[PDB]
Symmetry: C4
Amino acid sequence: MYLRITNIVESSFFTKFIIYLIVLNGITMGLETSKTFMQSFGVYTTLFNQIVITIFTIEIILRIYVHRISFFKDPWSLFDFFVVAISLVPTSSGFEILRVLRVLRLFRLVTAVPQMRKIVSALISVIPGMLSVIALMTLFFYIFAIMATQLFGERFPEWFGTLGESFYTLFQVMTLDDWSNGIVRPLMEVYPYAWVFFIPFIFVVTFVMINLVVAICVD
Amino acid sequence: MYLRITNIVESSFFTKFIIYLIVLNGITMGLETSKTFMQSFGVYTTLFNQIVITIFTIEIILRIYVHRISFFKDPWSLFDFFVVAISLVPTSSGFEILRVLRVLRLFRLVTAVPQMRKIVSALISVIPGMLSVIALMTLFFYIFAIMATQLFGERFPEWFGTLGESFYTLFQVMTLDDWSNGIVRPLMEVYPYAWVFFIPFIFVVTFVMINLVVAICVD
Amino acid sequence: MYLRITNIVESSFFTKFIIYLIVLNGITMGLETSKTFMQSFGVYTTLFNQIVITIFTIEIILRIYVHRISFFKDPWSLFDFFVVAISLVPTSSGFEILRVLRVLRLFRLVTAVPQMRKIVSALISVIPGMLSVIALMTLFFYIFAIMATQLFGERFPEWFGTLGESFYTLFQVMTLDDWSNGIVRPLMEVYPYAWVFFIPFIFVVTFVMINLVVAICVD
Amino acid sequence: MYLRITNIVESSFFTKFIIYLIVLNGITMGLETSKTFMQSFGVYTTLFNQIVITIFTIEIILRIYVHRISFFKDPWSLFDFFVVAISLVPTSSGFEILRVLRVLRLFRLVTAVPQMRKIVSALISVIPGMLSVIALMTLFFYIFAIMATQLFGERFPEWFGTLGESFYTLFQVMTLDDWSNGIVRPLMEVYPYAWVFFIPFIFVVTFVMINLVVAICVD
Ligand SMILES: CCCCCCCCCCCCCC(=O)OC[C@H](COP(=O)(O)OCC[N+](C)(C)C)OC(=O)CCCCCCCCCCCCC
Ligand SMILES: CCCCCCCCCCCCCC(=O)OC[C@H](COP(=O)(O)OCC[N+](C)(C)C)OC(=O)CCCCCCCCCCCCC
Ligand SMILES: CCCCCCCCCCCCCC(=O)OC[C@H](COP(=O)(O)OCC[N+](C)(C)C)OC(=O)CCCCCCCCCCCCC
Ligand SMILES: CCCCCCCCCCCCCC(=O)OC[C@H](COP(=O)(O)OCC[N+](C)(C)C)OC(=O)CCCCCCCCCCCCC
Ligand SMILES: [Ca+2]
Ligand SMILES: [Ca+2]
Ligand SMILES: [Ca+2]
Ligand SMILES: [Ca+2]
Ligand SMILES: [Ca+2]
């Protein structure tokens, strides 16, 4: 039977059947958005939803026998596993994000279409040659975040009161989002020299990010 | 008579005449903006406005006798057709945006003058090498738009209460516009972990976009 | 006498004597900024200014004898000339920006120092390649600015009430500056479909702009 | 004794011992952020701090013997000196920023780990071929910062009342932060033509910055 299923699973129709479900269940989830639609077709969809989870667990179970250890060593497969696994955790007990994280399964469209896998892989492959910079930056943030917590969090504890808060605020300044009226102008009303802290920060963090981009435009 | 008009249509003077009307009718539409001007010389304008549309339909009719099927397989010719057609629909009545969409005829300046054509073509021609990425993103937005609608739309239904609104808000965050004081900081007053949702979103979307930019430079 | 002065003008002293005044007059203009400093040494620096203005006319005259027609065909000299003329229009009458345009002379440091000219020239020489795009865009803006004036101007005259206002607001949206909370969201409280107008606009304008940037990477 | 310590200092254990301290002290400085943690274990980690600071001077004192004048001509070594030296200035007197500047020691993880060193060097090495542009801009700013101080600082002293404030506001405009609603729309309520000052400014500064980035994708 091994070769029987290995011919069922490895079949085009099998694959094309899965993709057809994903696009369908994907459509169905944009409908579960409507409060109106749920009051008219909620059950239609909730069963349709419970159905697909099996078909996908059936699929994932087959796929494992046909592949054994080769499966748990495949990124795309591992993914599909974990995503389907999340959707298996019962509706009620635990966190309620798990109900929401179910929609992560639409990323199977990525996993189950080679044209997607290409672009995704092409993207990810750039990350290794960025880790040195990414590490640098994180170290940088961490140092400034600490300085900021102890420079401004007594008078400005919403923004800088905690090391985590400073991280977020510093992130916000790095995206250049409402950084002067929204953050540094207020701070100067108490700390006139705060610009000595945030302008260099902006220079460094911006410089780094141009390199990181230009780094990518070479490799 | 074919070869008569074929020489009229293909004549330079024909083209230059058209290009002259466009830059003329263009200047007219900018004057039609002044409420003062219209109280003064509106009639002068509005009739001059109808005239141009006739000439341009005459022209478009001629250009069809001289090209037949080759016409309706030409983007630029199709454009002009679909643009002139709009401006032919009477001033009435259901949607009055049609009166406004008339100004799209000034894009004939692009269509008639080469070099413009050149640049527009060079711009457009970059698009197909991006579609794989665009589709990836659109799928991304769709997934997060859904997660957001059901994570935040009950307390925050201006921003997230509907799939469309979430699309809009997620777009706004992608342009990095007022994203932290304007949207995520509020949201954290109720949902402290909302940064777990938007910081990753920002990273992905930003990352993706840098690649897309660089992807263009490859070509 | 021609060759006598032609040896004075061409002299390293003369040229460096000028650069020396510019750096001096520049320092003095930032000093003229301090309301306090003017109450102490205002008349010093007021004379010192007219002094430099003579020396600079004396120079520009000598420079003309030595170069004649060649001088009025030099960008840097033409500039230097025009920036000195502005500083000569009496400290009164007409407009009083002329008192302020006098600070434009410190751009002589760009002229009087090579390398600077190198960089300014390197920068400028990129423009001609851009003009096809810059024309396309300007035509683009002009079309959309019209549509906006006549779509939002009656209810939103501060932002769109006049062709110029719409130009200004569209620019502000192009820089992605407070475009959604500050403009489109208000607009949608009256015109729910306004997103149909500004999202495409942003896509275009951002797309076009990336290409233009990538154009300057064709070198 | 020279060769003895020249073999201790130059040892792998020495380096990996120092790095182990940094990552340890670095963790300790994030914990000194928690006001809670300090009412409990503040004493432990305050002593732990002076301990590391001794070890770091011992280490720095050694390293100088083994290197002499070669040490003071090492960027990376000079740094470590300066940063350890700052942590030496007594926890009193002068300013309290010195206490905060102590956290700069965590940059030793950069100085004392290669790859980091490599990455930091790669970044810094791009700077020299930017100095001309940086100089151009810094000159540009200065001219406009002056022009703005005297065009807007009487009516708008918070933003432009002083050369420095104009520098600050002009920087903020350069990062495109809340530039139109936050600064220029207000300004046009008194100075309708102020757009003639900030739009050209934005073009120039943006243009230049695209080149500076394009430069780094040449060199
Ligand atoms: C790794 C590369 C990046 C390097 C940059 C990192 C260092 C940045 C320096 C931070 C600038 C200071 C920011 C801020 O002003 O600090 C706030 C505190 C308190 O200022 P304070 O004047 O005491 O405020 C009065 C407090 N009050 C009203 C409640 C009585 O203290 C200050 O206000 C006191 C004023 C200090 C100004 C002089 C600081 C110069 C440091 C420049 C860089 C040092 C060498 C690396
Ligand atoms: C390419 C995909 C990668 C991108 C990431 C995918 C999505 C990540 C999940 C986003 C996190 C959601 C943030 C959350 O604050 O949203 C609101 C929910 C609502 O549930 P709720 O329990 O009502 O929140 C607290 C209730 N309250 C405010 C009334 C006290 O509040 C939450 O339930 C709070 C509890 C969440 C704890 C942390 C969640 C861990 C998820 C991290 C990533 C998941 C695996 C990839
Ligand atoms: C490169 C060229 C790209 C072309 C795209 C640019 C032109 C797109 C037009 C933008 C759509 C209209 C924007 C905005 O909604 O306009 C306002 C009008 C009037 O709104 P209205 O619904 O009359 O509400 C008035 C409310 N009241 C009575 C209380 C004052 O609102 C209209 O009623 C909207 C009604 C639906 C409009 C649908 C038009 C989309 C198709 C046009 C695109 C085809 C050619 C590209
Ligand atoms: C090499 C690169 C150089 C870059 C170009 C430099 C740009 C400089 C242009 C300055 C624009 C002026 C902005 C602003 O309007 O300045 C304020 C003045 C005075 O306004 P004002 O008319 O007195 O308003 C009334 C004041 N009130 C109510 C208190 C009585 O407003 C004046 O009335 C302005 C006069 C109308 C426009 C005349 C300026 C256009 C000249 C453009 C620059 C010449 C070539 C570089
Ligand atoms: Ca912003
Ligand atoms: Ca903003
Ligand atoms: Ca705001
Ligand atoms: Ca606000
Ligand atoms: Ca921005």
